[PDB]
């Protein structure tokens with residue numbers, strides 16, 4: 001049907017998905033609850049991660065895979081898997097790990113278990129090519145099929161939305177992940193201590209602490225940050241009215 | 245012999261050695277996922293114990309996974325001697341082309357792709373890892389996957405495990421316990437079957 005058609009015309013099946021009640025006040029409660037954005041330039045290879053406190057309710061981990069530059073310092077899964085993520089994750093906490101679409105779908109699960117998480121949801125970023133159908137993909141040798149998506153694995157430890165993200169393939173060498181991942185995360189109401197490892201200037205954002213090597217500016221102060229969650233704010237979901 | 249063949253049986257106890265080698269294996273097993281059960285499941289060990297490795301020397305395995313079977317299927321895949329090299333997802337739509345564990349609503353189904361040995365002469369790259377198709381009936385896999393498999397490895401012998409009567413397909417041998425008897429046509433298969441099951445009962 002549609003896979004016969006992609007072998008015909010160059011349009012990925014997902015080019016044809018359409019539409020891609022008011023939970024709007026929720027977004028207002030996230031926005032009122034949101035800490036000011038904090039950010040910190042740090043070479044995470046060389047950075048004692050422990051210096052990040054307190055312990056985080058949510059970690060979004062977007063390490064720069066060598067596969068993202070399949071056309072244009074890359075981390076191997078060797079490197080990622082040595083991160084001491086378990087040291088900064090709150091006893092009950094969540095992780096969202098961008099795994100790409102190769103070995104990462106396997107190695108990333110080794111990581112989720114190495115750090116104490118169970119996989120909860122596999123969220124797929126499905127990339128349409130409505131604006132450049134005549135440009136197929138240069139496959140990994142191991143590949144059987146054209147690879148046209150990326151996976152973001154969700155993990156939990158301790159005790160409304162869909163698992164699909166449909167957008168158009170970024171330009172070769174643009175590596176930004178769909179901003180929609182932040183909405184999915186924020187709508188879960190998991191806690192207000194949110195950490196984005198390997199974020200960039202372009203990803204800084206209210207409600208989040210961003211740490212990554214390419215940041216050009218930093219404003220992080222552990223005491224200033226900690227101050228945002230002292231009582232009576234320690235346990236808010238991020239989705240409630242702030243305590244007066 | 246090109247046309248549909250099938251064998252009603254318990255895949256646990258059937259001697260799959262008689263069926264020979266297959267360029268492609270597909271299975272949509274009844275994993276023992278988070279309780280429920282509108283059908284009878286296999287335990288983890290029975291899935292580990294399945295005799296997939298006799299079925300191929302070089303070729304591909306297509307393994308449907310859901311829930312915790314996403315991790316368990318990766319284990320069986322590796323124990324059976326395969327390496328996962330791809331992963332197809334099916335996006336479930338309605339007849340007007342819109343989309344239809346605890347934390348998120350599932351819009352998709354996963355099918356791991358595994359390779360074993362050194363398959364040669366395959367049209368790797370023709371399709372993409374995404375299927376979009378209407379849900380024809382509950383718990384049914386979309387026909388598009390057979391198209392993708394045929395394009396991948398045209399003309400070759402294929403076997404489906406845990407298929408149901410609608411899954412019968414040219415070039416395929418379907419195994420399933422709700423199938424209508426035993427319909428076989430390829431002589432060598434009919435030979436090793438009569439030699440192994442003279443009185444025809446697993």
Ligand SMILES: CNc1cc(N2CCC3(CC2)CN(c2ccc(CN4CCC(C)(C)CC4)cc2F)CC(=O)N3)ncn1
Pocket residue numbers: 253254255256272273274275283284285308309310353383384385386406407408419420421422
């Ligand atoms: C005991 N040993 C056996 C068992 C055996 N069957 C075992 C029972 C069998 C038919 C064959 C198939 N099943 C079934 C139904 C649904 C699924 C889930 N999946 C998930 C992915 C989708 C969405 C692509 C598609 C749906 C899996 C299943 F497995 C429902 C059903 O009724 N029967 N055949 C021989 N030996």
